[PDB]
């Protein structure tokens, strides 16, 4: 779990939420962000572990973009 | 929730993991179960809340199964 992954994931979720007109001043925005973030980490857990093990890897932006879109699509259908 | 949602959700996760050949012996099995359980509850949060408040609704098997499948597909990519 490198910092670059963290920052890229955070940006993708912020952008995904904003793109959906979901404002950070609503009651479940924080819960929505957190579970998306945690789920996205868990999705890429194996590579994050390898990165931590010095594989010198980098989670690709494109794959993370798919993960976030899948999760936000799932988590915001009722919204 | 709606206790029936919770009981069915458990069965669908256990069943989805079984179909995929993922045994409870593997190292991340319980976290995999738990995060899928919670993400599925979250997905249907709004209806589940109305249900607990007496709306008379019921999350359909189809919808819940699609939820579980979306999550397990995403979470078991390895």
Swiss-Prot record, chain B:
Signal peptide residues on this chain, from the entry's feature table: none
Location(s) in or outside the cell: Nucleus; Cytoplasm, Cytoskeleton, Spindle pole
Transmembrane segments: none
Top-level lineage group: Eukaryota
Subunit architecture: Interacts with SLD3.
Further details from the record: Present with 1690 molecules/cell in log phase SD medium.
Family: Belongs to the SLD7 family.
Protein name, entry field: Mitochondrial morphogenesis protein SLD7
Range of the intact protein held here: 180 to 257 of 257
């Amino acid at each position: 779990k490198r910092l670059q992954f963290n920052e890229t994931l955070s940006k993708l979720i912020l952008g995904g939420l904003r793109l959906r007109g979901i404002s950070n001043s609503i009651t479940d925005y924080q819960k929505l962000y957190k579970i998306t973030f945690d789920a996205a980490e868990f999705t890429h857990r194996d590579e994050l572990k390898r990165i931590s093990m010095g594989s010198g890897e980098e989670v690709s932006f494109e794959s993370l973009q798919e993960t976030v879109e899948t999760l936000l699509k799932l988590f915001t259908k009722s919204l």
